[PDB]
Homo-oligomer: A and B are copies of this chain.
Amino acid sequence: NYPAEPFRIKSVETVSMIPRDERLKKMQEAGYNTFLLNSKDIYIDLLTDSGTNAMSDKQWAGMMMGDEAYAGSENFYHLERTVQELFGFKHIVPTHQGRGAENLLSQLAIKPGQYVAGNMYFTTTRYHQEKNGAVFVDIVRDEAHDAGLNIAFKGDIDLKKLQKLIDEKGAENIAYICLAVTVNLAGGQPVSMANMRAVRELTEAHGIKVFYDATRCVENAYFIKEQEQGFENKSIAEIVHEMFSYADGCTMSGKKDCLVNIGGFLCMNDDEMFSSAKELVVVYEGMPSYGGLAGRDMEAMAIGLREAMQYEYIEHRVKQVRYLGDKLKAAGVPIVEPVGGHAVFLDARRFCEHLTQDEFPAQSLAASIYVETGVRSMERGIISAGRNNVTGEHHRPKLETVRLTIPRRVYTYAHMDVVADGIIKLYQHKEDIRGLKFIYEPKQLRFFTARFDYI
């Protein structure tokens, strides 16, 4: 149903809300970009589930046993062994977080002019692919771009689209397939095991490599257990292990499903690629024996990845998100459906029908939720999508959304109720939300520090 937390609270941090008049000053001081607000001025911080998780007593015990040696740290061996056991890959290179591993993969596996195809883009991933000379091709099925369509396993790759790509371009012009689990910008939507099998079968027959974005793979495994016929009595760990058996390697931001505040890694099976990866990690991250992490953080990530396999933990994690979505849907608030593993996405096009996407309604809605509730949320729409690196025009995604992102093990259902009640009230006078225009635009990943003004 909605289960209670399968843990107790060991330690707390205080929350507080500043008056509406002062939030109004803060939002315009931040140029109406929620990324630019200060943590102390936020009451419930749903900007991201990345690095914001609460660790366990066992992880904090591991934090006291950091072996900070430059080479041969016990913490590295623990992390390496844990990932080999749970994911099944032959080799691991730690990185300080996920985009560090993406930096390595894109430099190792892309020849300029080749294609990289994935189930919907992501911001840092697509930037590193294009920066190294690849053309991104979206091979997610069309349904994943329709926010309201409630169907299972929306993250699945369209095998017909993948096949057409191989036929029009040729397999040797495809650097690799990028399969993300879950799919973040479709709403945290899962990929089925059947789809991972079929993608593996078709790519292998053409010699094309498959690399997973593993960042929310445990959430994805929960959906397989819950909804894919035949997996109902498999453990989360068995599902995770089988998932990665259809891949040649992975990038991972441990800051998501490894239940830590920093950390990531790169996995692969190929020996020559591992050799090249170790040469490159030294330049950007650190020695292959710590990869830009303190020993104590490799330890916490090794412990957290194993905690994430507990069924009751991930069931509660996902159903707590679902609770927030269910309360918003029962009141008529338009959301992306089905609710995904890590966040509820408000459909900003339906919330702000009076605005065109060129007026940045998602960015505008996020500012308004902060001013009316003190809750921080993130823009996931035209601002995040960036510009086309050939024409200079906005990428125009069908999904213009505002993300209420739930950190793991941090908030309660009563906090979800506070969030839901505040958004339901804002819905009543949604016509009051104004369009926005750029006054400062970065040349890449512009959503991080852009500044706006009301039209």
Binding site for B on A (CB under 8 A): 2-17, 35-42, 44-45, 47-48, 50-74, 77, 96-97, 99-100, 103, 124, 127-128, 131, 261-262, 275, 278-279, 282-288, 290, 292-297, 307, 310, 312, 409-415, 417-418, 442-445, 448-449
Contact = CB atoms under 8 A, between A and B. Distances in A.
B72 A37 contact: yes
A129 to B, nearest CB: 12
B56 A444 contact: no
11 contacts: A7-B14, A9-B54, A11-B56, A12-B56, A37-B72, A39-B72, A51-B70, A58-B65, A71-B448, A127-B283, A278-B442
Top 3 nearest A-B pairs (CB, nearest first) are A39-B69, A4-B414, A38-B72
B72 A48 contact: no
Contacts of A2: 414
A410 B70 contact: no
Q: How many copies does the complex hold?
A: 4
A282 B65 contact: no
B11 A15 contact: no
A60 B11 contact: yes
Nearest to A448: B282
A69 B54 contact: no
A96 to B, nearest CB: 4
A65 B55 CA distance: 13
B10 A6 contact: no
A262 B292 contact: yes
A12 B10 contact: yes
A4 B417 contact: yes
Given A7-B15, A39-B72, 10 more contacts: A8-B54, A11-B11, A39-B73, A51-B68, A96-B285, A261-B296, A278-B442, A279-B449, A282-B449, A288-B449
Contacts of A37: 71-72
B412 A14 contact: no
Nearest to A71: B35
Contacts of A283: 99, 103, 124, 127-128, 131, 444-445
A278 B39 contact: no
A370 to B, nearest CB: 12
Nearest to A259: B12
Nearest to A296: B261
Contact of A10 (B11, B131, B290, B417): B11
A58 B278 contact: no
Contacts of A297: 262, 294
Most chain B CB within a 10 A radius of its CB, from A3, A48, A449: A449
